[PDB]
Design a protein around this ligand. Sequence first.
Ligand SMILES: Nc1ncnc2c1ncn2[C@@H]1O[C@H](COP(=O)(O)OP(=O)(O)O)[C@@H](O)[C@H]1O
Ligand SMILES: Nc1ncnc2c1ncn2[C@@H]1O[C@H](COP(=O)(O)OP(=O)(O)O)[C@@H](O)[C@H]1O
Ligand SMILES: [Mg+2]
Ligand SMILES: [Mg+2]
Lengths: 31, 31, 77, 76, 523, 107, 98
Amino acid sequence: RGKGAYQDRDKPAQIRFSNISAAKAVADAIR
Amino acid sequence: RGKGAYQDRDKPAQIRFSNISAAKAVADAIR
Amino acid sequence: MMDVDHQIAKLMVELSKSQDDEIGDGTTGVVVLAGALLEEAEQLLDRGIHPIRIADGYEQAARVAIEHLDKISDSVL
Amino acid sequence: NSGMNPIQTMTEVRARQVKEMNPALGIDCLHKGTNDMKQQHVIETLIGKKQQISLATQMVRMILKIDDIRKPGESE
Amino acid sequence: APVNIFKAGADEERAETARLTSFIGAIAIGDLVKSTLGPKGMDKILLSSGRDASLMVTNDGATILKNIGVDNPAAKVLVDMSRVQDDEVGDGTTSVTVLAAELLREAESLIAKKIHPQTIIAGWREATKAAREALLSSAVDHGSDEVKFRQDLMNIAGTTLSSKLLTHHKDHFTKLAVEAVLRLKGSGNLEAIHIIKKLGGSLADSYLDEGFLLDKKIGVNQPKRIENAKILIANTGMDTDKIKIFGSRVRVDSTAKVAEIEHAEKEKMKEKVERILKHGINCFINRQLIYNYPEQLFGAAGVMAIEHADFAGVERLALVTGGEIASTFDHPELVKLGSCKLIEEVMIGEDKLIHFSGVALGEACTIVLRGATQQILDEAERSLHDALCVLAQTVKDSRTVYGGGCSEMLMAHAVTQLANRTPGKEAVAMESYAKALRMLPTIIADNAGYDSADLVAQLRAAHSEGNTTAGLDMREGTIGDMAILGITESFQVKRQVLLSAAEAAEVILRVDNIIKAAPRKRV
Amino acid sequence: ELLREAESLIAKKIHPQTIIAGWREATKAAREALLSSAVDHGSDEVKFRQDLMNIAGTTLSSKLLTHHKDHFTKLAVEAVLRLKGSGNLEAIHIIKKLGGSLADSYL
Amino acid sequence: TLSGMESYCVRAFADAMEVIPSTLAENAGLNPISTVTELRNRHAQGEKTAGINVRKGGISNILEELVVQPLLVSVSALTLATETVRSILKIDDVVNTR
Ligand SMILES: Nc1ncnc2c1ncn2[C@@H]1O[C@H](COP(=O)(O)OP(=O)(O)O)[C@@H](O)[C@H]1O
Ligand SMILES: Nc1ncnc2c1ncn2[C@@H]1O[C@H](COP(=O)(O)OP(=O)(O)O)[C@@H](O)[C@H]1O
Ligand SMILES: [Mg+2]
Ligand SMILES: [Mg+2]
């Protein structure tokens, strides 16, 4: 069996990548 | 006992008075 | 607390304020009663009755309502 | 507002005040059993209801005795 | 795609506002036509902003959705769903719109329960398969014993017209709808029943004509009524023929030869009419226009001439008189003529119409709708069209089910019985399918003003132990037997309500991304 | 969530004053559930100080101080324990300084 | 003779029939309060041909003044108007088509 299924249909999975991509631009600016 | 209560929270109780008041203006125009 | 710029409905605002200043309990019922006296006068207006003749008929009718309301009245405070 | 019918309730209470002497007979929301307002202790002041009929009659007289409106148009 | 957007004027959303705009736009469509469902539901009046607004009141859910013009992308699926329901069975367009919206409303309740949307699709496919067996096993067939089939047809027209403007006219309009399809005696072409709308009079003054009515009255100096006539129709050109040779001129040397050609042209037009009257006829119907030169020839011979009836007017006359089109007149022994008794002209609403009274082999009807306003006649035409289309398919499929909420509780019982024999992953989606099927008798019960919380609870308790024919009684406001009251619907109508709403809710629930393009001329 | 369930009672044609009178009897029964299940602590103060760390451990679990319950619970219990009187909530002056981790904070 | 909610609507149907004598008395310069009241007193006695006399300025016989109205004019005015107002209370939902 699959032992459950957790459907996560919400916003902040995409905003979490926005904080990652913004902090990568700061680290590459003063690289 | 009250033997029930029919709550009618919807639109067309007010639009039914609009069709009455519009037809009264036509009957008073050619009165 | 309304922004009604209508001079007839502004008199209904001062009617509810005058009930609050004198007695202070029937400010809601004095507007439904005043709207009921004017709604029943709409059908009498179409029958050719003069509006002052309706107003003179309301004073002779409200005088009976004052004298009949003073029949059963007692308190032992 | 209580969920009843205005014709089926007002006709029954008004007919009972003519067959007998007129009691303290009104209505209620949960209705408290019977419709006797003296048993349900629904007590209002005499001068409260006296000024409800007196002020509404005089305000109707000042809005029936008017046959012209001289309001302006726009603000400026 | 919102972050670092690479679009010009287009916007999109993924799994956050995609299902949010899909559930808002689809419920608001179903909540719009919610008040028009049932025998006590009100009607809508549709109006435009101006520029020949042409107000058209309709109670049928297909005509409401086809004129509103919804801007929501997911709401156009339910608009197109009700369009196919009107074109296939002609009924249940309002019932398929509320049922498809109540499925997505129960699917919106599964948002916070963290159910996977593919599990709801797999749960509803097993729920729809269990609901097909509930309607198929409860369908009542009718073969022989035709006195029970004609009584069954009046229950179909009585159920369809009860939810329309023809409320207190079931003693007359049921006979106008049953006998119209019964006079077809064949295929449901749905065009031999020509509905004529005339102002003046009440709806009780409407009637079904025993013959056929037409316009474009009989000539100038021609007889108006001929008893025991032979009707011959045509689809040929009478005058100014220019016969099929493009690039042919009259190149003569003198003007005296032009007078000989134009006399030879009128002799061939006279010889064509002389070939028509060799059949021994008294009436003539041409689909094209008849000019003055053949009109004098029919008037001198005592023959009628009905010019330019309609393109589909000669088809109804060929089905009501028993003849043929006969566009070529060169074999009188191979042309079958029509039959009639009276071709007198009747006056309906200060307009003279040609009444074909007493026709033989009359497989065509004419409903003379008379109403108070034009808004009533436009509503009664669509109300009769929603009743004739079901009876044209009830004679093709005689299977009928018990309507009035009885069919929906039978479908909801078969899903709930199989929802308990499933694991908990798909059993929650099957219970939401059965709750949406019970909403369809709940909308009917609450539109009349009854206690919808108790009547559907009495229907669920009745169908749980026997009572396969128990339904909702909208006359008194209780639970009664549908076989006694005679509230039945067709099997193919109730199947298309269940099947098309389950397929349309499958499409919208599977949408996780709405990428709309940039529109043109919108700034 | 009360008004979300009240939105579900829109289509059921329930009168809104019936929902108000139904919730007043429901809230009265809900007060008796918390009052009968409340655990008091008078004497035996070695179990009350353990009970106070369960209050601060539950409050700080829903905040940013997730993996600091071994330190910030002792910083919160002993701060109120050093008051020895009324909870004025102004004698505990919190000074915020940059530099260092949250484990470097102290009372 | 009726009961229930039907008895309050036929009285509303009968009170709406008094508008046309109230319209005819008001346009003629007569008092419409006493004209329709006197007309109900004449028809209760048995005067079926009583109406408003615009020449004398009161209530008199109609057939003496040669005022003749056909039956199809008044029947179709009552049948078509009742069938219209039976639909306006049934057709009530404002949908603005785009
Ligand atoms: N228990 C009850 N049973 C029946 N009627 C009641 C009861 N309590 C209050 N009412 C009615 O509700 C009304 C409330 O009026 P209210 O709005 O308070 O007037 P005002 O606006 O002047 O204060 C009263 O007129 C009273 O008759
Ligand atoms: N006499 C009746 N008793 C009980 N229910 C009825 C009766 N007449 C009609 N109904 C119900 O009213 C509903 C009307 O649906 P309708 O709006 O005609 O659907 P559609 O728009 O698809 O044709 C039907 O589903 C039917 O069950
Ligand atoms: Mg139908
Ligand atoms: Mg907390």
